[PDB]
Structure 1
Amino acid sequence: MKKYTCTVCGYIYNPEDGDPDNGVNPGTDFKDIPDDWVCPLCGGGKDQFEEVE
C-alpha cells in the first residue's frame, strides 16, 4: 500500500494510519476507501488524489 496525496491542498493519506475519525481504519488501501470520503483538509474528492511515488 502506497501513500496518496490530495493535489489540491497537499494532504497525505497514509494507509497505515487510515483516517479513523471519518471511519477509515488503519490498513485501508486508497481504492477501498468509500468513494464519498473527501480530503480531511480541503473537502476535495478522491478524484483529486495521486500516488505519492
Structure 2
Amino acid sequence: MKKYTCTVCAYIYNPEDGDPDNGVNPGTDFKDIPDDWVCPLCGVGKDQFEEVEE
C-alpha cells in the first residue's frame, strides 16, 4: 500500500499506521478511507492528497 501526502500541509498518511483517532484503522488503503475524512493537521479533504510514488 502506498503513502499519500496532503498537498496543502505536507502531512503523510501511512497505511501501516492509519489514523485511528478519526476511525481509520491501521491497514486501511487510502482509497478505502471514508470520503468525508479530512487531513488531521489542516482539515482539507481527500481530493487535495496525492500518492507518494517512489
Smaller-chain TM-score range?
over 0.9
The unaligned stretches of length 5 or more in structure 1 are none
The number of equivalent residue pairs is 53
CA deviation map 1:15-40 (0-9, x unaligned): 00000000000000000000000000
The unaligned stretches of length 5 or more in structure 2 are none
Runs of 4+ displaced beyond 4 Å: none
TM-score, length of structure 2 as denominator length = 0.96
Supply the distance in 2 between the matched residues of 1:42 and 1:48 (Cα, whole angstroms). 11
Identical aligned residues as a percent: 96
- 3-state SS of the aligned residue for 2:27? coil
